[PDB]
Amino acid sequence: EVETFAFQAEIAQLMSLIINTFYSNKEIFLRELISNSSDALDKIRYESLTDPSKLDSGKELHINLIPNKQDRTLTIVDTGIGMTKADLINNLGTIAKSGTKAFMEALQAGADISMIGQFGVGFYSAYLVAEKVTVITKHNDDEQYAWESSAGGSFTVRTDTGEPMGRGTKVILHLKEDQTEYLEERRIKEIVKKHSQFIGYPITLFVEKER
Numbered sequence: 001e002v003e004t005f006a007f008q009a010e011i012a013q014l015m016s017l018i019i020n021t022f023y024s025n026k027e028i029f030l031r032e033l034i035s036n037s038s039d040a041l042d043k044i045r046y047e048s049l050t051d052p053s054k055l056d057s058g059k060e061l062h063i064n065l066i067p068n069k070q071d072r073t074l075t076i077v078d079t080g081i082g083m084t085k086a087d088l089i090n091n092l093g094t095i096a097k098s099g100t101k102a103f104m105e106a107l108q109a110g111a112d113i114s115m116i117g118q119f120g121v122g123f124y125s126a127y128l129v130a131e132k133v134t135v136i137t138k139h140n141d142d143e144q145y146a147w148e149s150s151a152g153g154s155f156t157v158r159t160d161t162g163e164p165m166g167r168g169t170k171v172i173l174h175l176k177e178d179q180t181e182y183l184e185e186r187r188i189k190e191i192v193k194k195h196s197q198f199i200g201y202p203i204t205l206f207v208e209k210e211r
């Protein structure tokens with residue numbers, strides 16, 4: 001049911017560096033995730049031009065940001081192309097192995113952590129603000145899956161029984177206790193305005209309900 005996998009060594013090392021670094025400009029995580037969502041939306045849109053049935057699983061292309069102060073979670077949800085089981089357990093890490101290496105070489109050479117996106121490994125900037133990350137994802141060609149990792153060198157994959165989603169990806173950030181500023185409406189708005197103003201899809205920030 002729940003399978004556990006080891007990260008490749010280079011990715012484990014970058015995750016430890018990110019989760020333990022003293023780096024104050026942590027807000028870039030949201031730019032990186034929104035950008036990843038935007039690429040996923042780009043891909044399903046492009047593919048649907050030659051195969052319109054790929055949108056049977058959902059026509060709306062958007063990004064939602066959903067903070068939850070009770071659970072202390074921030075969720076980025078998109079209706080992009082999603083990820084398969086093969087992506088989650090192996091293929092993404094096969095690609096990220098080289099980008100993770102190049103990024104850590106650049107950090108040693110004096111590059112900034114905010115440049116992580118240029119190396120194709122921006123997803124891991126989520127561990128600037130999160131102690132655990134859960135990814136619920138559904139690709140047209142596969143079943144709905146739940147990926148999860150608290151760093152420490154391993155991650156799990158299981159078939160997801162909640163939701164379902166139709167198509168797309170939810171990144172659930174279980175925030176560190178001292179990073180709850182990223183659950184506030186005004187903070188999230190400021191970050192999106194500064195880093196994601198030109199994203200070509202509707203970004204809807206959900207507001208929380210209790211006064």
Ligand SMILES: CN(C)c1cc2c(cc1Sc1nc3c(N)nccc3n1CCNCC(C)(C)C)OCO2
Pocket residue numbers: 036037039040043078080081082083088092096120121122123124135147168169
């Ligand atoms: C480091 N790294 C790449 C990564 C590792 C992960 C991970 C996600 C990602 S980044 C991401 N976010 C996505 C999203 N929101 N939707 C669909 C796919 C998404 N990918 C994968 C790349 N997509 C490229 C493409 C095909 C869109 C050009 O989850 C567990 O381990």
